[PDB]
Amino acid sequence: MNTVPFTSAPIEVTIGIDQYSFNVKENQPFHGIKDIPIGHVHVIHFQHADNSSMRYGYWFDCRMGNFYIQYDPKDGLYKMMEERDGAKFENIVHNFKERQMMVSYPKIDEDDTWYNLTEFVQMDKIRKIVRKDENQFSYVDSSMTTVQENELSDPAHSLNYTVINFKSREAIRPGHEMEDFLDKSYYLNTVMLQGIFKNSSNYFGELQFAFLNAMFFGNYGSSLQWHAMIELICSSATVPKHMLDKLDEILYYQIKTLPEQYSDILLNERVWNICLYSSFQKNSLHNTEKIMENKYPELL
Amino acid sequence: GAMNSSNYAELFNNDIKLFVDDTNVYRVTVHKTFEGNVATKAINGCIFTLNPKTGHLFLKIIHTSVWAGQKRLSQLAKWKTAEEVSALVRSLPKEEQPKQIIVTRKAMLDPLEVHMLDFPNIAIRPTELRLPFSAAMSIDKLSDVVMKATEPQMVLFNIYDDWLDRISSYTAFSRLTLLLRALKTNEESAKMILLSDPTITIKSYHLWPSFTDEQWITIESQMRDLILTEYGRKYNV
Numbered sequence A: 001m002n003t004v005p006f007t008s009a010p011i012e013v014t015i016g017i018d019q020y021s022f023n024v025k026e027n028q029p030f031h032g033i034k035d036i037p038i039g040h041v042h043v044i045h046f047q048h049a050d051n052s053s054m055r056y057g058y059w060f061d062c063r064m065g066n067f068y069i070q071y072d073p074k075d076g077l078y079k080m081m082e083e084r085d086g087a088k089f090e091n092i093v094h095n096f097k098e099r100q101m102m103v104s105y106p107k108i109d110e111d112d113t114w115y116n117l118t119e120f121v122q123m124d125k126i127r128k129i130v131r132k133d134e135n136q137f138s139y140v141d142s143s144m145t146t147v148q149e150n151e152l153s154d155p156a157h158s159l160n161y162t163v164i165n166f167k168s169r170e171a172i173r174p175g176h177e178m179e180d181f182l183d184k185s186y187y188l189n190t191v192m193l194q195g196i197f198k199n200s201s202n203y204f205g206e207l208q209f210a211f212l213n214a215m216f217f218g219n220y221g222s223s224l225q226w227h228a229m230i231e232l233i234c235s236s237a238t239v240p241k242h243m244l245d246k247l248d249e250i251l252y253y254q255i256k257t258l259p260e261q262y263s264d265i266l267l268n269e270r271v272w273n274i275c276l277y278s279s280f281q282k283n284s285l286h287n288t289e290k291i292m293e294n295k296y297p298e299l300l
Numbered sequence B: 001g002a003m004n005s006s007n008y009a010e011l012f013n014n015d016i017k018l019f020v021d022d023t024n025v026y027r028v029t030v031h032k033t034f035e036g037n038v039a040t041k042a043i044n045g046c047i048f049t050l051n052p053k054t055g056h057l058f059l060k061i062i063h064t065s066v067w068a069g070q071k072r073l074s075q076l077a078k079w080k081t082a083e084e085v086s087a088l089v090r091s092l093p094k095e096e097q098p099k100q101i102i103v104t105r106k107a108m109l110d111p112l113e114v115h116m117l118d119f120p121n122i123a124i125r126p127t128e129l130r131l132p133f134s135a136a137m138s139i140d141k142l143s144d145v146v147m148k149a150t151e152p153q154m155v156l157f158n159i160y161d162d163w164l165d166r167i168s169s170y171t172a173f174s175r176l177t178l179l180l181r182a183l184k185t186n187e188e189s190a191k192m193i194l195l196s197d198p199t200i201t202i203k204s205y206h207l208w209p210s211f212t213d214e215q216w217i218t219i220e221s222q223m224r225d226l227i228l229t230e231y232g233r234k235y236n237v
């Protein structure tokens, strides 16, 4: 079980860790988060009390280094940093634990939610979507645009999700125009799975990461990517049976976790109705269709 | 964006454009079977591709053999249309290719866009106009060549005959859409108007009669009357 210490909390802020969150008052004696489960990526995220604008945060994996948070009064945000002196870090953390100045990652033993939301998400893939190679952790915020969004402006601060475009030469084989547009299996299985992602695990990892950035930061380009990656599978007549079963599990837990009061914006009516009721895979997402109908029958 | 009343003069500027109408591509008769069920029999159809500035009509005849063994024919017809329009564009010299293609039905947008991915600079546009191009098969010479075709065939016409010698393309398109609207509303009446005076003939190389300027004003007036008339006979006004 690992720890992310905070130097201090100089401004009032709502701090999230994965799907949890808590309020820290201005200059409250807060020195970080302990008992963070090893084996998963994690995200620590922030919304200032004064400016609820810009949610921002950091994706990290405590197996890759010792990380801490320190507020920067010049840039005006809580920054993640790596401590390279391992003895210094253990000593800092042990002292904060002795003074009981840390919150505990509050995981229920029965509860597999975070595993289920991050099953295929790997730090190494995150760091290719979010390019900043001098750090082992990755910054994301509400405003960052995607590579594809920029094509339709600062490249260093972009989300390099795989570009998916259903009316593109990449998606449409010359002479199979109608076939490839109406049944996207070629584009899913040959172009994307075999060609670009290499396997379905990396596909699902990017889909899961996009969903989580949409949910935690309200990142619009991330929501677009998540729905595009769903629609590409649902609009393929030929999908490996194991991918469909796993997709149903993935989407189930994403819909289960979504705040009820944010569905209006984070869920695209056209994509979900098409996917659950019109697409080739309309009968292959039993768990997802059941939770969607019981929780958001309005959208449908 | 879309083409409507507000931007109507764009049709007659010097940027090459084509209307594409797919109404008459997939044509059927519906009939009873010996068992008392219903079936369709396809008949030959056509793509109506028209340069509104020059009157050049590229009439691609769709022979019934193109449907043999195919399913979901109304959906296929849109993709076949887009295939043939893309093939036409590729066949034209670069300096003759359109800079825009306006489709008379919105369901042609995605098929045509996909078939034209190789032409990113050709704009594919819908229209808010309710253009009467379906009535093209009420023009006897066009109907005749479509029904006689025994194989796929492209037939080239000028739908304005020689009118551009005397009138502008705006006025020519207005006359054409007036004639076609009339033929679409009451084909029998419209055709009676056009042929009533046997001394005004249709040249062998033309589609419409050889009216003088004065006679076209009379004709155009009669077509207007017809359209309002039928509009009363239909609505009771």
Ligand SMILES: NC(=O)[C@H](N)Cc1ccccc1
Pocket (backbone or CB within 6 Å): B055, B056, B057, B058, B156, B157, B158
């Ligand atoms: N056959 C012809 O010369 C027509 N009079 C003019 C024309 C040319 C090219 C396409 C359609 C119509």
